[PDB]
Amino acid sequence: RDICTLDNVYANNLGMLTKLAHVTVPNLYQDAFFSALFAEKDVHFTQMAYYSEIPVGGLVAKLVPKNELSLKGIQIEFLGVLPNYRHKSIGSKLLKFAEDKCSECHQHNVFVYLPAVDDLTKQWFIAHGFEQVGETVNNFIKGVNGDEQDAILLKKHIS
Amino acid sequence: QFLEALKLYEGKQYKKSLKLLDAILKKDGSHVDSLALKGLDLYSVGEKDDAASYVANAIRKIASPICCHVLGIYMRNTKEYKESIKWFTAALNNGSTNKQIYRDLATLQSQIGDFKNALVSRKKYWEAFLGYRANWTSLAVAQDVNGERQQAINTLSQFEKLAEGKISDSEKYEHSECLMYKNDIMYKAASDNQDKLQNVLKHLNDIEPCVFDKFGLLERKATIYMKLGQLKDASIVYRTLIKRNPDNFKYYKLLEVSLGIQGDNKLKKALYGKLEQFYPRCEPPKFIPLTFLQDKEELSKKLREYVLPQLERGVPATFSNVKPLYQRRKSKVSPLLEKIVLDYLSGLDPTQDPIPFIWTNYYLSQHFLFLKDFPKAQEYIDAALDHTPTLVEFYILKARILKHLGLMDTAAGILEEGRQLDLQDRFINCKTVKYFLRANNIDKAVEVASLFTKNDDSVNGIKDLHLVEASWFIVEQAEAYYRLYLDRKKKLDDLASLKKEQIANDIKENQWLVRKYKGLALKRFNAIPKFYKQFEDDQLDFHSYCMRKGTPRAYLEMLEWGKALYTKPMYVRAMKEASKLYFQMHDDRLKKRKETEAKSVAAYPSDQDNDVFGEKLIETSTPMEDFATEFYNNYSMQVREDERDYILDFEFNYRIGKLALCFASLNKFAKRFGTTSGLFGSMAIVLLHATRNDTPFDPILKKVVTKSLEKEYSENFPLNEISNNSFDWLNFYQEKFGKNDINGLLFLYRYRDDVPIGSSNLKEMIISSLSPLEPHSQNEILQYYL
Amino acid sequence: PINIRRATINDIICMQNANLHNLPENYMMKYYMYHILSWPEASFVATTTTLDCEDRTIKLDPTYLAPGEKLVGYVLVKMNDDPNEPPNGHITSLSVMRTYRRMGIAENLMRQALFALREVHQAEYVSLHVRQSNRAALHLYRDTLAFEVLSIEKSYYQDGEDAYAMKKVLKLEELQISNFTHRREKLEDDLESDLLE
Amino acid sequence: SYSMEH
Numbered sequence A: 001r002d003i004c005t006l007d008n009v010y011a012n013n014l015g016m017l018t019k020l021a022h023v024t025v026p027n028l029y030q031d032a033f034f035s036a037l038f039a040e041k042d043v044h045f046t047q048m049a050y051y052s053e054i055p056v057g058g059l060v061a062k063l064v065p066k067n068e069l070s071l072k073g074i075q076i077e078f079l080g081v082l083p084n085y086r087h088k089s090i091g092s093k094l095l096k097f098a099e100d101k102c103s104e105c106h107q108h109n110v111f112v113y114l115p116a117v118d119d120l121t122k123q124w125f126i127a128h129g130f131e132q133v134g135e136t137v138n139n140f141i142k143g144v145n146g147d148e149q150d151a152i153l154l155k156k157h158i159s
Numbered sequence B: 001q002f003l004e005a006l007k008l009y010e011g012k013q014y015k016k017s018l019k020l021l022d023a024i025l026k027k028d029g030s031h032v033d034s035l036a037l038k039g040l041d042l043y044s045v046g047e048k049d050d051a052a053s054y055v056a057n058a059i060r061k062i063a064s065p066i067c068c069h070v071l072g073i074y075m076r077n078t079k080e081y082k083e084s085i086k087w088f089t090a091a092l093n094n095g096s097t098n099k100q101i102y103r104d105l106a107t108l109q110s111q112i113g114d115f116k117n118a119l120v121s122r123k124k125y126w127e128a129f130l131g132y133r134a135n136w137t138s139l140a141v142a143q144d145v146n147g148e149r150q151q152a153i154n155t156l157s158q159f160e161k162l163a164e165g166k167i168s169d170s171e172k173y174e175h176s177e178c179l180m181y182k183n184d185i186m187y188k189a190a191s192d193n194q195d196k197l198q199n200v201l202k203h204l205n206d207i208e209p210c211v212f213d214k215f216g217l218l219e220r221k222a223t224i225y226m227k228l229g230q231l232k233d234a235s236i237v238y239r240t241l242i243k244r245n246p247d248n249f250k251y252y253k254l255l256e257v258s259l260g261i262q263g264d265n266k267l268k269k270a271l272y273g274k275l276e277q278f279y280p281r282c283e284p285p286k287f288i289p290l291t292f293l294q295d296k297e298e299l300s301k302k303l304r305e306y307v308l309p310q311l312e313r314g315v316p317a318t319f320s321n322v323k324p325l326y327q328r329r330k331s332k333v334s335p336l337l338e339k340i341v342l343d344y345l346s347g348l349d350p351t352q353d354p355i356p357f358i359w360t361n362y363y364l365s366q367h368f369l370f371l372k373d374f375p376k377a378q379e380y381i382d383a384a385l386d387h388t389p390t391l392v393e394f395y396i397l398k399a400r401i402l403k404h405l406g407l408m409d410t411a412a413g414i415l416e417e418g419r420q421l422d423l424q425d426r427f428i429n430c431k432t433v434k435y436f437l438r439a440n441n442i443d444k445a446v447e448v449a450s451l452f453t454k455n456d457d458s459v460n461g462i463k464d465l466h467l468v469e470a471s472w473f474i475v476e477q478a479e480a481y482y483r484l485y486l487d488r489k490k491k492l493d494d495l496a497s498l499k500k501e502q503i504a505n506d507i508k509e510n511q512w513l514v515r516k517y518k519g520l521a522l523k524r525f526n527a528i529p530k531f532y533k534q535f536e537d538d539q540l541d542f543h544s545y546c547m548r549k550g551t552p553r554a555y556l557e558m559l560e561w562g563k564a565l566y567t568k569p570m571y572v573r574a575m576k577e578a579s580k581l582y583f584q585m586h587d588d589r590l591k592k593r594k595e596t597e598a599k600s601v602a603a604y605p606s607d608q609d610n611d612v613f614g615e616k617l618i619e620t621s622t623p624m625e626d627f628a629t630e631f632y633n634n635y636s637m638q639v640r641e642d643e644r645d646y647i648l649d650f651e652f653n654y655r656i657g658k659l660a661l662c663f664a665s666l667n668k669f670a671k672r673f674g675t676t677s678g679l680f681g682s683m684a685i686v687l688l689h690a691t692r693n694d695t696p697f698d699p700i701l702k703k704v705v706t707k708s709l710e711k712e713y714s715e716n717f718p719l720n721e722i723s724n725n726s727f728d729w730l731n732f733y734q735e736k737f738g739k740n741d742i743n744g745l746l747f748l749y750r751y752r753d754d755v756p757i758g759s760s761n762l763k764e765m766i767i768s769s770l771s772p773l774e775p776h777s778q779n780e781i782l783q784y785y786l
Numbered sequence C: 001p002i003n004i005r006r007a008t009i010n011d012i013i014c015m016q017n018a019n020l021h022n023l024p025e026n027y028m029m030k031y032y033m034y035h036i037l038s039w040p041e042a043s044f045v046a047t048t049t050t051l052d053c054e055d056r057t058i059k060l061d062p063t064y065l066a067p068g069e070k071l072v073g074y075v076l077v078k079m080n081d082d083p084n085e086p087p088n089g090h091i092t093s094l095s096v097m098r099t100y101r102r103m104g105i106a107e108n109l110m111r112q113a114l115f116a117l118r119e120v121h122q123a124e125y126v127s128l129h130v131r132q133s134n135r136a137a138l139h140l141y142r143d144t145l146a147f148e149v150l151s152i153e154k155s156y157y158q159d160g161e162d163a164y165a166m167k168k169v170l171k172l173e174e175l176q177i178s179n180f181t182h183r184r185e186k187l188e189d190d191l192e193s194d195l196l197e
Numbered sequence D: 001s002y003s004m005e006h
């Protein structure tokens, strides 16, 4: 089939998704965050991207049901591809899964917080139809190293 | 009635039969029948101890024919096959009319290797039940095994005549098998006699339409043609076999021989060129030329054509596929492949050719690892890992390099990083377990292993791993406990010398450990012989089942397998390593809240075993007899002369005073490996030292052995020189066998108290002999051998 | 390089060792003997090969079959011998050591197994169980070999994972190994000429 | 893979 495919993440290959997140977005995720994904009320969607059967990227998104302004819907919590496999539509395929889940859940918003300094990534979401919402969010991102930084919020409307 | 309890045993109402038999014996407690069947019900309900006491009481009181049969079954169940035979026979001689007993006897007689009597039993059962083909097949098999081949063939042929036109669809598989089996016997008896061989071929042609084992028929057909010198005919059949399985190397080489081109590289090149067109995805056409091409440029072109497409597709075992060329053609093939694969890499881009890029780096990692350039091997695997850190295989190769460097803990850690990526895959789990055992981290190894075991009623998987007969784990764990044992014995001797005081707390702690590890090493090793005896016992059902099922050729292969069980690699490994413990226990005898730990290391059910730490094994007064009964005797009765470990032989007999068997082992070793071997030299020097009038051996032996050494080895050793305290045996050794013959030096070193030749110089000689070895080997010698 | 051949009882200790390394479903030696002594033409193994070149005893290692030959994969096959369907077979176990995966070994073993079941045993179909989350195994059976899903078996494995029960209908001519010599003019041996033409 | 447990 297509050389790039998506498939499910299970408890057994959760560590694969954790490794992908650690090499593509260092110092943001507590390993607990990954562990909470498969421990038996908030709903997550997870997915791995394979290139010729190699896991090279992944996605963690969250259904946010409700008080809340227009940042209800699907939150993208992780979306990352290994550097050497970029620019092959794999990130677009993962984002599209997220967007599609939004509509399956009859929601109309997909959003993501990014580091305010990460210009390149912001431009990539904007090329995919996202828009910045308001301005920089004061010290929103706590690092594993206790560091902090400002986030921006981006949003995209789904019919 | 006692007959009510027999039917009530035949029917599985074992309690039910028991109420009955207790009432009978309340009146008559010396009723032989009653006591005997008590045993067998009690046995069938796990109550093994009582069963044994009731059976043995009945044997004292001694019987009935029914009794004899009950006892026959009980004994079969407890694996007393020879006793079972005694009781089944007594059942007949005391008037049983049950003709099935002859079938049971044939099974038991076959199991113990008494085919002479088995054949008698097959004949009587066949006479009683001629209507069942199984009984014809089994008689023929007995005839064949007793060397009565024509009779075997006649028995099979007589059944065929009776069955002509009376074989149903469901009986056709058995028929096919029995047809091929007859061809086998005819074929062996034909030998190289051309007329006989011609008739065997005729038979094969005749039966082909009723034989469903087409590979087997084709293979027999080719070999017949070969022995008839009809090579062209053979060649057509081998081509027919290749087409059926073009991934079978053996067929290709046999085809070469049938075409008379074994010695003709020109024609071989053409043959495989042609075969490559029919079979483009298959290894043999691409690979076989790599074994004979000599022209640098042609070999080089062929190497390239074989390995580059595999790298391109990203196959992991690309290196491993060529590894046997690096092993047999090192100087020729490795420089050529180094250049080929380095040039291929330089053309690749990591973002456009990611798959070939990472797997080419992986190949080159394997390449430099094989050639012992470890830093370069790490560079190449690092490049792969950094690029694509999601491939478990890359963690395996990096760990493996670290293993060769002696970094066992680091190596285990990398593997553990790999394991975390894939909790589904048992293979990376097993290798991670193996690496932690190699680092002596038994607790982590067991925790990791236990993720895949059924631990249902246990804190971990040790019991499961014993149930599923996992020698891989058990041997590696045994070896890890032995290392820990030797480490703690060192830390124990260092603690004594550091008495110059709760240091006595630290030695009582260590003294427990030395014993705990020494015992668990020995207990884990003793798990292996138990598996292999069960494999032998496992044959029992097949003496009848194969006959019924119609697979006589496979049955005879089972017999041969059973006669080699105690020579298989993991058995021999456990035996060889366990001997270290028994031998030292012999040499040495010539100079609380465990309740918690007990559960974490138990191997077997509570009832079967109370010696959880193997204390009884290490406290033995008879370590040598224990090695013999638990491991060595079975190995020794089965092993072939051409695989026999004569050094084990020597070292075992040396410790039971049998110096003449030591000489025999030494002599046979030399016949095979010659008299330049350092191991030959060291065994000779140790044995010579044993013929010294001061030594604790029998003088009659020292005398006979002195003469055999004179008879055979007068011109190899200065035999006269054991009387000169100034003669430098160690110096003579290095002159003759060189100072790099590590294994020969290590043998002497093992006998350094018994055969003192300058233990300090010997040690230093071993130390300076280590430099050519890889680091891991250097270190394990420094730590565990010296 | 890897050699593919029919299994014998001399391979079952190493086959068990391979199973033990590669799968959570394990069996006692008696069960392998039952297979190899009941269906002696149906199981196949994959081994390394050390050929003599123009330019020892066996390693004490649980994968080794003979000097220079160790077992890297196997397919363990039986006929269905319960209680009254037409003849059908079962793939009891298939595995390949991880360092040897992704080069066609499983595929090669499987094709020899399907053809043998048809040829030797007139098997009409073959069945097997596979974990739902086993990507590699699903690709092999569904895509490469065109097995069908027959059902879902809930909580089939010991750790509780659901299986697919899968099935493939067997017909002799389409299973012939010569049909698979070209991955992608398909020349064949007619078994007639002289090859050195 | 056949599971002999069930």
Ligand SMILES: CC(=O)SCCNC(=O)CCNC(=O)[C@H](O)C(C)(C)COP(=O)(O)OP(=O)(O)OC[C@H]1O[C@@H](n2cnc3c(N)ncnc32)[C@H](O)[C@@H]1OP(=O)(O)O
Pocket (backbone or CB within 6 Å): A024, A025, A076, A077, A078, A079, A080, A081, A082, A085, A086, A087, A088, A089, A090, A091, A092, A093, A112, A113, A114, A121, A124, A127
């Ligand atoms: C808080 C959180 O959620 S996590 C933070 C977000 N993630 C990160 O910061 C992690 C680091 N970044 C990454 O992993 C990657 O850069 C991602 C995920 C952002 C993008 O992944 P990629 O797989 O490169 O996405 P994709 O390939 O679909 O698109 C990248 C570009 O290549 C282009 N492209 C698509 N297909 C092809 C092709 N065949 N050839 C060339 N270019 C292509 C796209 O159009 C896009 O171009 P543009 O941006 O100039 O319009």
Ligand SMILES: O=P(O)(O)O[C@H]1[C@H](OP(=O)(O)O)[C@@H](OP(=O)(O)O)[C@H](OP(=O)(O)O)[C@@H](OP(=O)(O)O)[C@H]1OP(=O)(O)O
Pocket (backbone or CB within 6 Å): B320, B396, B400, B403, B431, B434, C059, C070, C099
């Ligand atoms: O002997 P071990 O310590 O258990 O190590 C072995 C050994 O490799 P080295 O001794 O060269 O490291 C194998 O090679 P052979 O002895 O069979 O030639 C190798 O097998 P391959 O080269 O065929 O891969 C195998 O590697 P693996 O099992 O990963 O394929 C590897 O075992 P470890 O990787 O567990 O160290």
